[PDB]
């Protein structure tokens, strides 16, 4: 189908983020590839401005749900690919419990044969010795369910989920995600029935990289319709 046909093979991915958290300005660039056939993508991210002022794990959700594997019997519910190549706007508010919040605006679209995620991130009202600005988050990542519903009035989707970030003392830092996606182009898109994406993510380091960086391996599969 339109859009989906662009994802049958391996697709290069570029991610570019500019961020400001409590006045700490930074940029991140990522490169990698995705194979939606297998719900798989791999990326390496670099902080191009120096040291990242927030923990890497807090940026994972912000840093391409078009690479999710939609089972054949759910293909009519894949909004993300249906909006391609023109793309979609992905906006979030991320509430860190007992701490500050991120607001993000991204455009995800093809530039030539590459899938590009371009993001502006703004974080405010973080505690200086909270888990975020105090860098108390472990370098790992849990598996989540990402809940999706149609937003027919916006010709898009509404998405909600709760990220669990492990803290170095055994506790959990919750990050409540509220998300909206709307197409950039004016063509038709697939508006889905309620369903979810099951995610899993592995964080690692490149032993040959001296810059502040994150290597990510992610698998995502749509479910919840039988
Ligand atoms: Mg196929
Ligand atoms: Mg633990």
Curated annotation (Swiss-Prot):
- Keyword terms: Chromophore, Luminescence, Photoprotein
Resulting phenotype, residue 167 to L: In R10-3; matures to the red-emitting state with excitation and emission maxima at 555 and 585 nm, respectively
Effect on the protein of changing residue 202 to V = In EBFP1.2; shifts the excitation and emission spectra to shorter wavelengths and increases quantum yields compared to BFP
Tell me the outcome of changing residue 189 to A.
In mut1.5; shifts fluorescence lifetime from 3.03 to 2.72 ns
Tissue expression: Photocytes.
Consequence the record notes for mutating residue 145 to K? Increases fluorescence at warmer temperatures such as 37 degrees Celsius. In Esmerald; leads to brighter fluorescence. In VisGreen; leads to brighter fluorescence
Q: What is the effect of changing residue 142 to I?
A: In ECFP; leads to cyan fluorescence, folds faster and more efficiently at 37 degrees Celsius and has superior solubility and brightness
Biotech use, per record: Green fluorescent protein has been engineered to produce a vast number of variously colored mutants, fusion proteins, and biosensors. Further generation of mutants led to more stable proteins (at 37 degrees Celsius for example) with brighter fluorescence and longer fluorescence lifetimes.
What, per the annotation, is the impact of changing residue 220 to R? In Azurite; shifts the excitation and emission spectra to shorter wavelengths and increases quantum yields compared to BFP
Among InterPro entries, the record links this protein to: GFP (IPR009017), GFP-related (IPR011584), Green_fluorescent_prot (IPR000786)
- What result follows from mutating residue 158 to Q? In R10-3; matures to the red-emitting state with excitation and emission maxima at 555 and 585 nm, respectively
Subunit relationships: Monomer.
Its protein name is Green fluorescent protein
Origin organism of this chain?
A: Aequorea victoria
**What is the gene name?**
GFP
């Amino acid at each position: 189908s339109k859009g989906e046909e662009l994802f049958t093979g391996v697709v290069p991915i570029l991610v570019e983020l500019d961020g400001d958290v409590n006045g700490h300005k930074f940029s991140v660039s990522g490169e990698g590839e995705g194979d939606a056939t297998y719900g798989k993508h791999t990326l390496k991210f670099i902080c191009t401005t120096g040291k990242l002022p927030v923990p890497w794990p807090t940026l994972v959700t912000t840093l391409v749900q078009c690479f999710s594997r939609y089972p054949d019997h759910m293909k009519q519910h894949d909004f993300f690919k249906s909006a391609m190549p023109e793309g979609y706007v992905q906006e979030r508010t991320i509430f860190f419990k007992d701490d500050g919040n991120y607001k993000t605006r991204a455009e995800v679209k093809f530039e030539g044969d590459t899938l590009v995620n371009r993001i502006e991130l703004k974080g405010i009202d973080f505690k200086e010795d909270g888990n975020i600005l105090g860098h108390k988050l472990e370098y790992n990542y849990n598996s989540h369910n990402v809940y999706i519903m149609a937003d027919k009035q916006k010709n898009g989707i509404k998405v909600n989920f709760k990220i669990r970030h492990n803290i170095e003392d055994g506790s959990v830092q919750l990050a409540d995600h509220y998300q909206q996606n709307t197409p950039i182009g004016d063509g038709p898109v697939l508006l889905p029935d309620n369903h979810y994406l099951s995610t899993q993510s592995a964080l690692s380091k490149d032993p040959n990289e001296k810059r502040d960086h994150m290597v990510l391996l992610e698998f995502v599969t749509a479910a919840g319709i039988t």
